[PDB]
Design an enzyme around this catalytic site. Structure first.
Site, PDB file in Angstrom:
ATOM      1  N   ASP A  31     -46.254  28.337 -23.029  1.00  0.00           N
ATOM      2  CA  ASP A  31     -46.967  27.256 -23.650  1.00  0.00           C
ATOM      3  C   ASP A  31     -47.456  27.767 -25.001  1.00  0.00           C
ATOM      4  O   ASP A  31     -47.143  28.906 -25.414  1.00  0.00           O
ATOM      5  CB  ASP A  31     -48.049  26.651 -22.693  1.00  0.00           C
ATOM      6  CG  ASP A  31     -49.189  27.645 -22.304  1.00  0.00           C
ATOM      7  OD1 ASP A  31     -49.284  28.721 -22.902  1.00  0.00           O
ATOM      8  OD2 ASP A  31     -50.021  27.311 -21.415  1.00  0.00           O
ATOM      9  N   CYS A  34     -49.243  31.350 -25.587  1.00  0.00           N
ATOM     10  CA  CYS A  34     -48.551  32.586 -25.204  1.00  0.00           C
ATOM     11  C   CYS A  34     -49.023  33.856 -25.933  1.00  0.00           C
ATOM     12  O   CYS A  34     -48.954  34.927 -25.339  1.00  0.00           O
ATOM     13  CB  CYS A  34     -47.046  32.425 -25.397  1.00  0.00           C
ATOM     14  SG  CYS A  34     -46.631  32.106 -27.139  1.00  0.00           S
ATOM     15  N   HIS A 122     -42.475  32.643 -29.262  1.00  0.00           N
ATOM     16  CA  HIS A 122     -43.030  32.981 -27.956  1.00  0.00           C
ATOM     17  C   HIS A 122     -43.363  34.463 -27.862  1.00  0.00           C
ATOM     18  O   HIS A 122     -42.603  35.301 -28.329  1.00  0.00           O
ATOM     19  CB  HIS A 122     -42.061  32.663 -26.830  1.00  0.00           C
ATOM     20  CG  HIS A 122     -42.601  33.060 -25.490  1.00  0.00           C
ATOM     21  ND1 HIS A 122     -43.645  32.387 -24.886  1.00  0.00           N
ATOM     22  CD2 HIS A 122     -42.329  34.126 -24.694  1.00  0.00           C
ATOM     23  CE1 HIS A 122     -43.959  32.995 -23.748  1.00  0.00           C
ATOM     24  NE2 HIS A 122     -43.179  34.046 -23.609  1.00  0.00           N
TER      25      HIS A 122
END
Length: 129
Positions: A31, A34, A122
């Site tokens: 999400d 992160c 990410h």
């Protein structure tokens, strides 16, 4: 990059990091939190502490708003966290050595916070078992 080439890149990186450095990529939930998840795993051993890490990062920035107002890779958050935890933050990017290191207060250099930064913005936690 095609989905298969992407997965090949991810798999190669996990294996290279395990085999060359003995580090494991621990998957954080994907999400928007992160980065704070990865730091929470590094500091507390538990990504559930992500909102506390974020709160403390924001608290630190606000407290130091005169300095950080000079400047407004997540560089600002990463400097704040390295300083606040008194540990460098090492960022791996499909690399087995860090691409860069936020030094924090230049202490505890043998106990870095280690994160990996991947495609689609990410972050994961890089763990030394």
């Amino acid at each position: 990059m095609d989905p298969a080439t992407v997965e090949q890149q991810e798999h190669w990186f996990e294996k290279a990091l395990r085999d060359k450095k003995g580090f494991i990529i621990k998957q954080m939930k994907e999400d928007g939190a992160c980065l704070f998840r990865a730091v929470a795993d590094q500091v507390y051993g538990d990504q559930d502490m992500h909102e506390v890490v974020r709160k403390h990062c924001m608290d630190y920035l606000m407290k130091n708003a005169d300095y950080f107002s000079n400047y407004v890779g997540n560089h600002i958050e990463m400097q704040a966290m390295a300083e606040m935890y008194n540990r460098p933050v090492e960022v791996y990017q499909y690399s087995t050595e860090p691409i860069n290191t936020f030094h924090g207060i230049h202490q505890n250099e043998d106990e870095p916070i280690r994160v990996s930064y991947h495609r689609n913005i990410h972050y994961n936690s890089v763990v030394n078992p």
